Amino acid sequence: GPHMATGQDRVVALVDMDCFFVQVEQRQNPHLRNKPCAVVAYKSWKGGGIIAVSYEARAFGVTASMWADDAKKLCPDLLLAQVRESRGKANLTKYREASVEVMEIMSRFAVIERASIDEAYVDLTSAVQERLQKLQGQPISADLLPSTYIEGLPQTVQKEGMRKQGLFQWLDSLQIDNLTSPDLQLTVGAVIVEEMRAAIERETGFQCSAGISHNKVLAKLACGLNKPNRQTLVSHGSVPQLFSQMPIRKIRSLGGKLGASVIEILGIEYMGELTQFTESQLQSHFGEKNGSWLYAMCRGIEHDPVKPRQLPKTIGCSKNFPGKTALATREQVQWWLLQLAQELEERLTKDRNDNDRVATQLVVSIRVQGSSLRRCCALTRYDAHKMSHDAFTVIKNCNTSGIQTEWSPPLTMLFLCATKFSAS
DNA sequence: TGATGACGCT
DNA sequence: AGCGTCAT
Numbered sequence: 125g126p127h128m129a130t131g132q133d134r135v136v137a138l139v140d141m142d143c144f145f146v147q148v149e150q151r152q153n154p155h156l157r158n159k160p161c162a163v164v165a166y167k168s169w170k171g172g173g174i175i176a177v178s179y180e181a182r183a184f185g186v187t188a189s190m191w192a193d194d195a196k197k198l199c200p201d202l203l204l205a206q207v208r209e210s211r212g213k214a215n216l217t218k219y220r221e222a223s224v225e226v227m228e229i230m231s232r233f234a235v236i237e238r239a240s241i242d243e244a245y246v247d248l249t250s251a252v253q254e255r256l257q258k259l260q261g262q263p264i265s266a267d268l269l270p271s272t273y274i275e276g277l278p279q280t281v282q283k284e285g286m287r288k289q290g291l292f293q294w295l296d297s298l299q300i301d302n303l304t305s306p307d308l309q310l311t312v313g314a315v316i317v318e319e320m321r322a323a324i325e326r327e328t329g330f331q332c333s334a335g336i337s338h339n340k341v342l343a344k345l346a347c348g349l350n351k352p353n354r355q356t357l358v359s360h361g362s363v364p365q366l367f368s369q370m371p372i373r374k375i376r377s378l379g380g381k382l383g384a385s386v387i388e389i390l391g392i393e394y395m396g397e398l399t400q401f402t403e404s405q406l407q408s409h410f411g412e413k414n415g416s417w418l419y420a421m422c423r424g425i426e427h428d429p430v431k432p433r434q435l436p437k438t439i440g441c442s443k444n445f446p447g448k449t450a451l452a453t454r455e456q457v458q459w460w461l462l463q464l465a466q467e468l469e470e471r472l473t474k475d476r477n478d479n480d481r482v483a484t485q486l487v488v489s490i491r492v493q494g495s496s497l498r499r500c501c502a503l504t505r506y507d508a509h510k511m512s513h514d515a516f517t518v519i520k521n522c523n524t525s526g527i528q529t530e531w532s533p534p535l536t537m538l539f540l541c542a543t544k545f546s547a548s
Numbered sequence: 549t550g551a552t553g554a555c556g557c558t
Numbered sequence: 559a560g561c562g563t564c565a566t
């Protein structure tokens with residue numbers, strides 16, 4: 125009763141760019157705007173592997189992890205943009221720079237946690253308190269939430285009509301008299317996220333979606349409910365009905381083996397069904413941490429903090445060498461390690477200038493024909509010849525080949541990663 | 549025929 | 559340390 129915590133203490137948002145690499149290329153090439161289009165890496169195997177797809181192309185059934193040649197069979201007029209290729213590999217710099225544009229805008233509003241190249245969490249709790257104080261108690265107009273969905277509402281045959289009826293039901297029952305109402309706090313949060321999304325679009329050209337809720341898992345789930353170019357508020361109150369038919373795999377961290385295990389062992393399908401189990405039962409099946417997390421999460425409660433981190437903690441680059449293209453000579457392994465090391469050196473030097481830090485450890489990881497081995501060594505100089513030589517040094521005993529000159533068994537992946545940053 | 553990045557476990 | 563899971 126009076127002592128049951130309800131996970132309503134924070135206002136958390138997740139902001140995710142719509143079809144992000146596609147928008148970067150459409151911004152640059154207006155001919156691609158408002159068209160079915162995709163971004164592809166490489167070009168020679170089946171037209172290239174699709175890694176991002178515009179919403180217009182999705183309407184034809186085009187997805188990522190399709191080959192371009194196959195996507196063209198579903199969508200003959202599909203337009204393509206190719207990822208930059210440098211030193212014989214895909215080069216994601218354009219997308220990393222576009223990412224910085226968006227992250228730097230978000231950070232003007234609140235401290236952010238960079239979750240991927242195109243999304244970030246935001247803890248808006250303080251910003252909301254402030255805005256609430258700034259508002260004497262004026263009601264919140266629907267005009268301040270022009271792209272917001274209230275999950276579970278309403279209670280019209282056009283999508284925008286539904287959106288508005290839902291929003292009206294929400295605002296008409298909101299208690300503005302109480303500065304401590306969690307629902308009021310989420311609503312103000314959504315006003316701020318409208319402002320943040322407007323600034324991102326105005327200053328970059330990019331559209332995004334967002335989720336606003338009381339923790340990161342519900343914000344992330346909320347974000348995906350109305351895409352593209354919209355945002356979704358998931359209140360604590362909305363959780364029982366939302367979770368009652370929500371497959372377990374949709375919740376962040378449950379989309380893999382653990383979630384599969386929850387479904388198999390407990391004989392359930394939906395997040396809501398977890399409420400029937402004691403915390404001890406879940407801990408017994410899935411371990412102390414996972415069981416506690418599940419017990420709370422199925423009730424809409426999660427305490428994972430928005431971490432104050434807007435820069436990546438590692439800088440890496442890798443290349444696959446599949447099938448017949450696997451690396452089978454030593455000079456080959458050396459040459460690719462050098463290409464990787466050269467890209468890594470460029471990115472590290474840039475990073476050192478921009479962000480006042482230096483990496484101190486080099487991780488080298490490989491795969492053998494059908495992840496292989498990982499070995500580390502000191503990163504003491506941003507020098508590509510030295511890093512590639514050192515990477516070779518620590519992986520060279522992997523070679524079972526006796527008289528070579530040669531590399532057995534052939535290498536199907538190479539990976540260099542700079543880590544353990546210190547201030548500089 | 550893919551290229552990344554964060555974090556948990558022992 | 560090195561390996562594994564989960565995700566974009």
Ligand SMILES: Nc1ccn([C@H]2C[C@H](O)[C@@H](COP(=O)(O)OP(=O)(O)OP(=O)(O)O)O2)c(=O)n1
Nearest residue numbers: 140141142143144145146175176177241242566
């Ligand atoms: N397996 C993946 C998934 C994504 N990306 C890249 C291309 C995407 O544009 C970008 C962001 O990934 P998202 O999963 O957020 O997908 P999009 O932003 O492309 O689409 P959505 O609008 O559905 O978020 O990261 C990638 O290289 N490999």
Ligand SMILES: [Ca+2]
Nearest residue numbers: 140141142143
């Ligand atoms: Ca996205």
Ligand SMILES: [Ca+2]
Nearest residue numbers: 140240242243
């Ligand atoms: Ca994303």
